[PDB]
Amino acid sequence: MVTIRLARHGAKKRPFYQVVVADSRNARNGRFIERVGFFNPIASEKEEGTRLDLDRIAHWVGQGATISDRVAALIKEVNKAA
């Protein structure tokens, strides 16, 4: 199974999640096929907080990739524009 999932990369008490496409049996912050966006749960209240490449996500779900609950929640957040 390949999974589009989050991978924790920020500092302590300040996570920055990068949404990647990994073979699901790798580690979380390990090996991935391609990274496809990010998700900062803070970032500030400025402009984005999250961008996420929907074309490549649709490509991988076309291939057979699964999606975790957060990535599904983010696609349900950034629906097409908002």
Partner RNA sequence: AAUUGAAGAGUUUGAUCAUGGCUCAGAUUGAACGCUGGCGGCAGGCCUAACACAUGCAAGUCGAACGGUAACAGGAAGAAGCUUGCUUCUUUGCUGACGAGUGGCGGACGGGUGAGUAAUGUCUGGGAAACUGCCUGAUGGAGGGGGAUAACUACUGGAAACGGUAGCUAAUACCGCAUAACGUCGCAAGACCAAAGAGGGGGACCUUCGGGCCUCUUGCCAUCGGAUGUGCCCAGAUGGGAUUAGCUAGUAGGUGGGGUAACGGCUCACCUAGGCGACGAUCCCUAGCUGGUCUGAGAGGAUGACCAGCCACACUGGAACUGAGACACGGUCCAGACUCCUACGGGAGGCAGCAGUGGGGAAUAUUGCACAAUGGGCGCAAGCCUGAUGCAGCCAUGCCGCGUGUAUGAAGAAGGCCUUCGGGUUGUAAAGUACUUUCAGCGGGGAGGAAGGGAGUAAAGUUAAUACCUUUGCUCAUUGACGUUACCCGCAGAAGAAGCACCGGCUAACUCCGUGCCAGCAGCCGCGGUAAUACGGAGGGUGCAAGCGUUAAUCGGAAUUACUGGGCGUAAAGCGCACGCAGGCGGUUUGUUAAGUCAGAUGUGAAAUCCCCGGGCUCAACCUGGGAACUGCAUCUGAUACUGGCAA
**List of residues contacting RNA (CB under 7 A):** 1-3, 5-18, 23-31, 33, 35, 38, 40-44, 46, 60, 62-66, 68-71, 73, 76
Question: 45-62 burial, b if ≥16 CB within 10 A, otherwise e?
Answer: eeeebeebeeeebeebee
Residue whose C-alpha is closest to residue 2's, from 32, 39, 27, 35: 32
Could you tell me the smallest distance in angstroms from the CB atom of residue 21 to RNA? 8
Could you tell me the smallest distance in angstroms from the CB atom of residue 54 to RNA? 14
Could you tell me the smallest distance in angstroms from the CB atom of residue 64 to RNA? 3
